[PDB]
Amino acid sequence: IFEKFGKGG
Amino acid sequence: QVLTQTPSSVSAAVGGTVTINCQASQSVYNNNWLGWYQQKPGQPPKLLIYKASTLASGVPSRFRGSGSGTQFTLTISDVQCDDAATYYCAGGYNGNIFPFGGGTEVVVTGDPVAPTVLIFPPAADQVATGTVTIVCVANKYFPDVTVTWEVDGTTQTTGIENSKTPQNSADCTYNLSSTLTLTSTQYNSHKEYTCKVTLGTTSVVQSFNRGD
Amino acid sequence: QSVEESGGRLVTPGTPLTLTCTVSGFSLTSYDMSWVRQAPGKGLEYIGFISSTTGGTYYASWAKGRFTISKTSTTVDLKITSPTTEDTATYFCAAGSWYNMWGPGTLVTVSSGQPKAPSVFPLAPCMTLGCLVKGYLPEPVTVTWNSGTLTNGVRTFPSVRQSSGLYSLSSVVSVTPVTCNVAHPATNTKVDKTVAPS
Ligand SMILES: [Cl-]
Numbered sequence: 001i002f003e004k005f006g007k008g009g
Numbered sequence: 010q011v012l013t014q015t016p017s018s019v020s021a022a023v024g025g026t027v028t029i030n031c032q033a034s035q036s037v038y039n040n041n042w043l044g045w046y047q048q049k050p051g052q053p054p055k056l057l058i059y060k061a062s063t064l065a066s067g068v069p070s071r072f073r074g075s076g077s078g079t080q081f082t083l084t085i086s087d088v089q090c091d092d093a094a095t096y097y098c099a100g101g102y103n104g105n106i107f108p109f110g111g112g113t114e115v116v117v118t119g120d121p122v123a124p125t126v127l128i129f130p131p132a133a134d135q136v137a138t139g140t141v142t143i144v145c146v147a148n149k150y151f152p153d154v155t156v157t158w159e160v161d162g163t164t165q166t167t168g169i170e171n172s173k174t175p176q177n178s179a180d181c182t183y184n185l186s187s188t189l190t191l192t193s194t195q196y197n198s199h200k201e202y203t204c205k206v207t208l209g210t211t212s213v214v215q216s217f218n219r220g221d
Numbered sequence: 222q223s224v225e226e227s228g229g230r231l232v233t234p235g236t237p238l239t240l241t242c243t244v245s246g247f248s249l250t251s252y253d254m255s256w257v258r259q260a261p262g263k264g265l266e267y268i269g270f271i272s273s274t275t276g277g278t279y280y281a282s283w284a285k286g287r288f289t290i291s292k293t294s295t296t297v298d299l300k301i302t303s304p305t306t307e308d309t310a311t312y313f314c315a316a317g318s319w320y321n322m323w324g325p326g327t328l329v330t331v332s333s334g335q336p337k338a339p340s341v342f343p344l345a346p347c348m349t350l351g352c353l354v355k356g357y358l359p360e361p362v363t364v365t366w367n368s369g370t371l372t373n374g375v376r377t378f379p380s381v382r383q384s385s386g387l388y389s390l391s392s393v394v395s396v397t398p399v400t401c402n403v404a405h406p407a408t409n410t411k412v413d414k415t416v417a418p419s
């Protein structure tokens with residue numbers, strides 16, 4: 001598990 | 010967690026092709042979270058390529074991104090003097106890890122261009138301060154030069170500082186300033202000041218005589 | 222549309238300082254807002270960012286504790302909690318998930334020096350004319366010719382640091398009556414020299 005990836009595009 | 014960018018430096022002639030590689034220690038996010046940037050000295054970076062292969066708006070088609078997973082490539086075709094810059098990759102990983110690669114300098118090469126040389130005596134108002142700065146400029150040359158100072162024929166070893174402009178975006182040439190610092194006493198002691206600019210084995214010489 | 226950093230200045234080690242990032246022509250919250258720095262002659266280093274998708278603030282592992290990112294109604298801010306010599310750098314803010322839009326950068330100088338305005342001396346051969354900009358701190362100075370109207374044939378060399386800790390550079394221009402305009406923003410100083418041949 002990881003913190004939600006924070007870059008969307 | 011590391012992007013290994015290779016090589017550190019690369020050269021092409023005008024109209025040549027450059028390859029720059031970026032290798033991730035593990036897979037980047039979604040196998041494609043990798044961007045490419047161009048940076049010229051004194052300027053902020055500019056985005057070239059995002060999502061490994063998408064060209065940013067306004068970017069020339071000669072910039073191409075490729076790869077997926079751990080191995081990414083930027084190529085530059087039809088290299089121009091304007092492409093002389095440092096290029097960086099920047100990636101994204103699960104866990105919100107966003108490293109830059111360490112950068113690749115691109116040097117755009119060509120036929121030697123011989124410098125012209127100018128020398129500037131210190132302004133009247135400098136002498137009064139107790140310290141004097143003599144400036145020598147090597148104009149519009151390629152590739153690199155070395156500079157020598159002679160004062161009344163004696164080669165100077167200390168008090169010299171050099172500074173070089175980045176490659177000219179139109180013609181790839183450099184300019185160089187060489188500054189000799191002396192005390193007012195040392196300056197007012199001597200007559201003939203000489204700047205010698207060496208490109209390869211060939212020297213161009215410029216001089217002045219104090220008081221003229 | 223633009224981003225602009227502010228707050229770069231000379232500070233002694235351990236003196237906290239805050240940089241601000243201001244956006245023009247779009248909303249502070251529309252896009253990812255990042256802080257990146259670049260030590261003199263070195264590579265780009267990511268510090269942290271505020272996500273437009275999660276709303277969250279993230280830091281590079283190395284930067285945790287050394288920097289605090291926060292926002293006001295009008296700025297994204299970067300506090301350097303206890304600056305060291307090693308924090309001397311240009312700090313950039315950037316908008317977009319791909320660092321799409323960058324500011325010009327703001328320079329942080331961490332050292333024991335006191336600010337000093339440059340002396341400006343005319344350069345003329347015993348045609349190309351110039352100005353020597355000698356003995357300032359911190360960087361930068363800006364040099365223009367004829368108040369920004371003369372750009373063709375202008376070469377402004379990179380600064381060099383002398384033993385004193387003071388910076389120097391020259392600017393030269395080629396023509397067939399020319400004035401160099403030197404600004405030292407740190408001290409709000411403006412110097413003009415009209416350079417005459419001979
Ligand atoms: Cl980084």
